[model samples]
Target: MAVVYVISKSGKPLMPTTRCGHVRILLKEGKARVVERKPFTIQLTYESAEETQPLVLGIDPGRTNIGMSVVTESGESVFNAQIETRNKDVPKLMKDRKQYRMAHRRLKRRCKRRRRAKAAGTAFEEGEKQRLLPGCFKPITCKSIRNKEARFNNRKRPVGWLTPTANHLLVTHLNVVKKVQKILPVAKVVLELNRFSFMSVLNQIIPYLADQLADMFPGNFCVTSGQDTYLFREEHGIPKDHYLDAYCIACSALTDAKKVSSPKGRPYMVHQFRRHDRQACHKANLNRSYYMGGKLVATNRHKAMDQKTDSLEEYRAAHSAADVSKLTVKHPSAQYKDMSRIMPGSILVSGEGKLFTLSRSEGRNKGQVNYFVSTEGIKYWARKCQYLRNNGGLQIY
Candidate 1:
């Protein structure tokens, strides 16, 4: 069953209806315009009654996954979704980025020193000897040459501060709820608080988040324990899944347990990914140098092959000396493409009506090829695939 979300003329959320034919007629007659595709939403052009049913939104928040469901007071589910977050690798990526930045700065400074030595007609051996001095000589710190000053007692985390990764997850939860509220007139919010483990960081985070949610929804916010969620699911004969747990949590808000029935339709799968890479370029070329079997060698000598040789001398001996002079070592700078037309996570409709979410573009050419999340057997041509929609960071399918 296809679910279409509808909004009023003044842009207020209304009760969603399962009447696909009516929605199609409204669209065809220009009485409403499409706002979103997946979980298809439309906004009415003419004034209409604002009558709405009481809807309760249930949330099951976790470290990497969030389950959401919207249900009426009669225990009928309108929407369900499982949101997968991509914030797990944020700390590791930030560390790698810091290493890259530090390596780049040091490499630049080293190259400048070499250039200055060359300009001064200083021999390589003599320039190397210049750094070696007697023990009596004034000791220079390694930190002095790196040109980075340490901040002492200057950086302070403000009140209500959170780590970058935690802050991101928190904001994502808030945004997802806001998006649901935009499509459905939610009267109350039921959050299934996880206290399964004593050492879990969520114990610290969720309470603060619950306080924030209470501020957002005022008197309508409700908190339920994981035990309550489990009991509801077990009593209602709902399967144990993230989204189903959310459904049960939502239905638990209803006055009568008999009103709760098995929810129909599958939940939407929502994914959140970083839209852009913050790192300006890859690791410096100087860092790519390695000591292979006690012999220093560069990883890539040829741009086309991009193969590594065992030793520097062996690589020099393989090709003619003149060809060695033509060695194409690519720069460490990153290459960016114009992704305005086919951005990552954008859906492409094939000629045969198969939908593929674009993972990325492969080669830059006249007849380009693209990589998709699913449908690996099918070859998608750039020109042949119809542009559907770029859902940006949050991909709902």
Candidate 2:
């Protein structure tokens, strides 16, 4: 039968009488002849009761991760799946690529103009675009902005405040539900109007995120009233994280697991966040491995530059170091990126939380300290002072 390409049968495909699909139970009910039943094998005999029956589905929605479902009143599940949603950065990534592309095209045209100008050897005054530079940084452009001012409409949003791209997450269940119902005989759709809070997840993310799969659910059809059977996910390898929750909701509707719970007399709690230490940013770009490969052959190397150094005359002699490339790369002392100091005397006269910029440093009428930063500062026997605190400033003839 036809199944969603996104679905990968986990562990093993179900047996003839024990098999499945995206809406797993729909197919399982049909019929298959079991073969060996050895550690594996679901050789369906292909003779299922043509007459159909409907069942409920539990779903956890999203562009990525989590969704589960179950049977009408049986024991085991008819559909148990873990779906991994792909959140593409394709469009945003393409936008950046386009920007770089346009910049290159513009640069190429300008280069041609300059070459022709030189060959022709004609008078050409420089344009601002001619002065603009190209660098790792994208050149800044601030023109043609509508600069439209907004007052009320900008802040107050309309109804249904969800990201447009995130709809695939919640909508899949409905689509599948519709497909499966055509074959099975759905009586009541029992979705869980599940509780939700941002950033909660597992084996699941945003636990029950993308759910309530029907009202709060948006809308739906066939065999579902809903439930609080916020089923926890189970053992599987496709790693839907929330897929089992989807299964749990579906299964609860099937067996006595719900009616026969609370073997104990008390309530309890478990802190899911106890595992937290660090996390990854979703918005970060494609792995730089495109350039650096997997190992990053850079920092975090072992035998990694544990240095030996000292200033006192005595302690230094104790440990004669290995004559090797000395790189106290991690230490502040190893950081001499430039030879320029604070221009001999320019200090923090900048704006709040400020630092040095340029200003007069010579006489009362001394101009903007002329000599810009360099290894050997432009200095000579001082004449009419026009430089900074201690250098021959701007080129004074």
Candidate 3:
């Protein structure tokens, strides 16, 4: 179906389409120009007509990954992406720090007890012990004197409460919907069911997120069983299970929609990029740890009864940006990555002689160059050394 993503003349944003004939005719007449090649995006030299159609967005939220797709009433998937999630590292790091502090404190108190015992035998120690302790002067053992008064009351978990890690799942979905709403006129939303639902707490009177989306998208939204979202009962690869269901949910919302022929193939030109990012595995996967003395366990492994003695090693994850690039491939190289040098919305020229613009890393990619757009619906991956700025020669992708 060679679906096309279109942007307006003033560079705000606009809906996408699968009208290859219309785009071809518009380009030939010099009414529009090429923007990108991978996603097959186009930008009008002038304003695009106001005529537009409604689209349905399907969201399949996973514990670690999110599948999103949008389909028009004509049954064409105009946008699709499987967003890789980052919800493990922050909590694990918190656990590691707490455990380290407790370990250090345990050792420190032992030293203080030994010093006090040694002084008890000394002449000056007896004199000081009488004043320090009226009737109790004993060694600190397994059970030592401790504070035992209830300091504060425990509050019950409020309505619409989600764990810290799971809360991020909702935030990612919310942010994606906000960005899509700016461009696509989403008429309805369908979310695949999660055993642990977070959306119950997602739309609360939240910060820059909750009321954030409600104001933007005033659309009908519903939830369905994950199995029912898949239109095809057939089996496929394990990786695409969520993606297929996402599309099915998008089309399943409308009955009159006609099926658009699939353009689910690689780019037609050398300058084009792969439509989606693929994980490159060259190492083993990592886990997370959870140890706490005076705080809550930050690692999720604590919930598992099987692992009674999990270590800090068990709570491992992609530590740095370099480790995470394997999953998303969005981070610019260390020698090439610089926020101060290259800012967002910067005009980029690739080695393939393709120029494009970057959008702010709103939700995903964590302040990295996340969204890329060009005229004519093209995707250009600018490799370092091959892509450079004309002025100070800044590197970019």
Candidate 4:
């Protein structure tokens, strides 16, 4: 009798049934036989079920210190290395110097144009004529547009945003890849998103590559949002974002030869923000809370000048620091207050209270201050208070 192996969707072999209707008897009776097959046929047979020896490289990108780890097939960590890119690469320094000069020249031209426009009254011409009537209306013109332009110029400078540092990091990583390729030609490279830093670098690098080097690589390169990696994690419990990206690249590499596991979750199915209210609140608090001890003062020179002419300006100037202090002064914003109103240590109900709509900051002009009032923040605060109260205000680690 010819024997055959029944395979499941994942390529795992199913047992043949015995005449007595027992599945285990086929294996127990010592009748199992090996079937000969070609290499490609065998690969295709197990393509669906085969598990690759995944070498996950987790890279937590940072400005000063980048954390890196390599995990092998069994999830055992293999190599860990941290590459310091700050103030080390001379070429990057020179490139940045050149970029700075170019940016400075560009900004100088822009400022000159702006000054000419402003002196010609073209900057506020639309609103100027409406306010020419004496005491008919308070001018709504932005008095510090020039100052704002200067600050904007300062921010727009290439170095201020670490564009050069980011470029250096990419070059460094590419060099790392070149070196590692010599040893592990087939190994997948994983880069963990350090969130903000990764984004900053990615935004700059992707555009540069697309515009300057697209002809060289063609469609071999791809750009994905951090949210893309997040989806993979949500569906497959992949844990690390960098590993997910590496896994994706690996899957892409093997697409023609095998079928890698499909991403488990829907790409767009993000957990509702309200569902993670506590976590969100904790993050919000971490972003918002700060300590201040010195007396507050307004440091704006223009405000000081305005104060010399007007009593209101004097009051505003004298209290500039105070205003900042008052604004920065922490109170559980509406969100926090609402969280307190609800039961502590419990998940917040969706659309339950005003807390859901509370502004994290009063407004952007108000220093973009975050308010810690998420469900999680409230719980943390309550837990701390309870602990302190029970321990007679003693410090507890």
**Candidate 4 lDDT:** 0.36
Worst 10 residues of 4 by lDDT: 388-397
Residue 40 of model 1, lDDT score: 89
lDDT of 1 by residue, 212-278 (tens): 8999888999988888877777766776655688888887777864567766777788777577654
Worst lDDT window (10 residues) for model 3?
A: 267-276
lDDT of 4 by residue, 1-397 (tens): 1222233334343322223323235335533323212000111122333333544444444444444444444343333344444324545547766886777765886567667777887675453332223333454334313333222222345543445446665555554444333222124444433335543554454444333332433443333344655664466455554323444423222224233343332221101111112222222232222223443322332344333333333445545666544533332443333333232222322232322211122211223222224322331222212111111110101
Q: Please list the residue runs of candidate 3 whose C-alpha ends up more than 4 Å from where it truly belongs after superposition.
A: 10-12, 17-40, 100-159, 196-216, 230-240, 260-263, 266-397
Total backbone clashes of candidate 2, pairs 3 or more residues apart or in separate chains: 42
- Model 1 CA RMSD to the hidden true structure, in angstroms: 6.8
Q: What does candidate 2's lDDT look like per residue over 148-217, in tens digits?
A: 2224433665665444334433344454555434333444454444335566222232223334433432
Alpha-carbon local distance difference test for all models: 0.73, 0.35, 0.52, 0.36
Candidate 2 Cα misplacement greater than 4 A, ranges: 1-49, 74-76, 88-126, 129-243, 251-397
RMSD of each: 6.8, 26.4, 15.3, 20.9
TM-score of each: 0.75, 0.33, 0.50, 0.25
The deviation in Å at residue 397 for candidate 4 is 32
lDDT of 4 at 80: 37
Scored by lDDT, model 1 comes in at: 0.73
